Design a protein around this ligand. Structure first.
Ligand SMILES: Nc1ncnc2c1ncn2[C@@H]1O[C@H](COP(=O)(O)OP(=O)(O)O)[C@@H](O)[C@H]1O
Ligand SMILES: [Mg+2]
Lengths: 526, 77, 58
């Protein structure tokens, strides 16, 4: 260290050896933190907060685990961010990507120990990634022209995605919820159209998908409690002191009777507006804002059910379900469309009452009721159903699939090994390492079930080398089996994203040779 | 056993007699705290709904199955 | 059988700790069950006093 000080007090610098040591330690620690939750027989983690009022949760999601821990190592933040954006993009694949990145870094440390320049490793990995992505692309199977095959593929994808999460206790049941719900969207990717309602009590197998719609709102006093053959007007307008006549006007008179007269005129304005609303021929009114108690009795006298305070999401979901439009100004009854439903009533679930719409016209939005015996169970169930719906929507958008259970990783590794056997120099030693990373995802899975991972991986490699391109792990017994027969199916987009993101994150981290830290901002104690 | 302990009865003998009487016919035997022994329970007019027992068993089993899935504890912010 | 060595003991320790905590809670509330069970009095840190036999309240 030079005698002259270039830095302030508290600033820090680490150079090549220490920089690489710190980065590799952080990356490997992050990978091994979440290795344990991979595959059909992974376990869950308990997270409790020291600061956030002792909040408690039980989770298996990789992104949820990584977004909550307080990492301070700079090399771990890159992995956390990559996992987060993977979750934001496809919604599945959060654990495989970070495990693969950690394995790549673990191989790179030994490669550096063998006196190989980082740039050589980077070039070898780039070529290996190109070959692996080509081999994956050539293996895709594209259905979608035939309805029954596509629906069977959707069921297989949902079952594969739900196998590692708690819902696997009732894997068939919840599968029927995951497919049908998505098929209600009629090709729209709006996942906000599916509302998930979770409420305590009852068992996990009592959950269902409603054939109509459910609102957790209330109707006004002295209005009908149920209507048959309803006609629905959906509005977004002010009804509590509607006369925000936005000008800066004021009342300046010389007598109290004039104030009384102006008050009466104010009431007549609301009466006229309510009459104009009723001119449409409705018997149900839904508003997103509050409704004062004078229009409440005006609606009650006319035998019209009124719903108040149904926020933007509720208004849009009802517009999708029934088919009306969100109207205002009520001057042209002919140009506005009304929603229709066969019955509206009130149902009682647990300890609460909800408004139930049955016999709806379109049905392009749905609601799901989750039941369970604990808050953590309900939260994890929602967290898993979200992944299932996300992957199903991705598959519907782009319908080409691959095989899971270690088939795809073995295919990629075989292609990379064949490429590496053809090239001269040190780069070959890099590419082989790449393959040894891809064959670690299957091994880990077997390691979570207590099987002899080495023998199974050797058999799988031997089978893939001779042309059996559909071999994979059969985990209900722990053998080698056909993935097409057993129905282990995944989407192409998720695997491609996992591969590309892991490769780019490893390349980004591997190029760092010097870490510089500024003086931390001191928390003001007193 | 708990019901036998809280009433000052001998738990081992009481549970053995309960099992012996349930294994040879009648299935309404129970602990009588008024008599201090084991007798038919409907003669004492103590009954309860079925939903209570069914819900209790189902919720308890589900919670145990959920607990058995955990293998780690992590401290967060 | 011959192999599959388990090199980590943390999961077993965590499972045993969970078992112990649950059994401790059950044993604590055992005494309130039955027609011949007694009540418990809880004094909150603020200073409020409750006397109860209900399990959820306790
Ligand atoms: N029934 C199954 N048999 C074999 N492998 C499976 C099965 N279900 C899922 N897998 C594998 O488990 C992996 C899924 O990882 P998972 O634990 O769901 O978290 P993530 O999908 O976020 O990595 C996939 O690579 C898939 O190949
Ligand atoms: Mg998954």
């Amino acid at each position: 260290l030079a005698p002259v000080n270039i830095f302030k007090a508290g600033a820090d610098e680490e150079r090549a050896e220490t920089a690489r040591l710190t980065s590799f330690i952080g990356a490997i620690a992050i990978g091994d933190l979440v290795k344990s939750t991979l595959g059909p027989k992974g376990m869950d983690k308990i997270l409790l907060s020291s600061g956030r009022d002792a909040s408690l949760m039980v989770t298996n999601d990789g992104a949820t685990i990584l977004k909550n821990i307080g990492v301070d190592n700079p090399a771990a933040k890159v992995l956390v961010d990559m996992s987060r954006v993977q979750d934001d993009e496809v919604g599945d694949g959060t654990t495989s990507v970070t495990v693969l990145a950690a394995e790549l870094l673990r191989e790179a440390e030994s490669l550096i120990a063998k006196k190989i320049h980082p740039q050589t490793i980077i070039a070898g990995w780039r070529e290996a990634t190109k070959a692996a992505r080509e081999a994956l692309l050539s293996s895709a199977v594209d259905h979608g022209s035939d309805e029954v095959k596509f629906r069977q593929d959707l069921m297989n994808i949902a079952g594969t995605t739900l196998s590692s999460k708690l819902l696997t206790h009732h894997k068939d049941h919840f599968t029927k919820l995951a497919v049908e719900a998505v098929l209600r969207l009629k090709g729209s990717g709006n996942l906000e159209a599916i509302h998930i309602i979770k409420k305590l009590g009852g068992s996990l197998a009592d959950s269902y998908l409603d054939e109509g719609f459910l609102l957790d709102k209330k109707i006004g006093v002295n209005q009908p409690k149920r209507i048959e053959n309803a006609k629905i007007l959906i509005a977004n307008t002010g009804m509590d002191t509607d006369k925000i006549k936005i000008f800066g006007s004021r009342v300046r008179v010389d007598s109290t009777a004039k104030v009384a007269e102006i008050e009466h005129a104010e009431k007549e304005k609301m009466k006229e507006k309510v009459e104009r609303i009723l001119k449409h021929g409705i018997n149900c009114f839904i508003n997103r804002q509050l409704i004062y108690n004078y229009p409440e009795q005006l609606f009650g006298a006319a035998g019209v059910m009124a719903i108040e305070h149904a926020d933007f999401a509720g208004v849009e979901r009802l517009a999708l379900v029934t088919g009306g439009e969100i109207a205002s100004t009520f001057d042209h009854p002919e140009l506005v469309k009304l929603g229709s439903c066969k019955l509206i009533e009130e149902v009682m679930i647990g300890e609460d009452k909800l408004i139930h719409f049955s016999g709806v016209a379109l049905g392009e939005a749905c609601t799901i009721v989750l039941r369970g015996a604990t808050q953590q169970i309900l939260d994890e169930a929602e967290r898993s159903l979200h992944d299932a719906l996300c992957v199903l929507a991705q598959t519907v958008k782009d319908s080409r699939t691959v095989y899971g259970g270690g088939c795809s990783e073995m295919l990629m590794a075989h292609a990379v090994t064949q490429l590496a056997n053809r090239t001269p120099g040190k780069e070959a030693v890099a590419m082989e390492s790449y393959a040894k990373a891809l064959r670690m995802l299957p091994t880990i899975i077997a390691d979570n079930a207590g099987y002899d991972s080495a023998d199974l991986v050797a058999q799988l490699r031997a089978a893939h080398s001779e042309g059996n391109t559909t071999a994979g792990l059969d985990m209900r017994e722990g053998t080698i089996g056909d993935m097409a027969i057993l129905g282990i199916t995944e989407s192409f987009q998720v695997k491609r994203q996992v591969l590309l993101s892991a490769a780019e994150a490893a390349e980004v981290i591997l190029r760092v040779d010097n870490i510089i830290k500024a003086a931390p901002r001191k928390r003001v104690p007193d | 056993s708990t019901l036998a302990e809280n009433a000052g009865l001998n738990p081992i003998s009481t549970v053995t007699e309960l099992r012996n009487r349930h294994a040879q016919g009648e299935k309404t035997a129970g602990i009588n705290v008024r008599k201090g022994g084991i007798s038919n329970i409907l003669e004492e007019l103590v009954v309860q709904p079925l939903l209570v027992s069914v819900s209790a068993l189902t919720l308890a089993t589900e919670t145990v199955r959920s607990i058995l899935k955990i293998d780690d504890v992590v401290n967060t912010r | 059988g011959k192999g599959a060595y388990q090199d980590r003991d943390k999961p077993a320790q965590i499972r045993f700790s969970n078992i112990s905590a649950a059994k401790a809670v059950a044993d604590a509330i055992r005494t309130s069950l039955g027609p011949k069970g007694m009540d418990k009095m809880i004094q909150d840190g603020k200073g409020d006093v409750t006397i109860t036999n209900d399990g959820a309240t306790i």
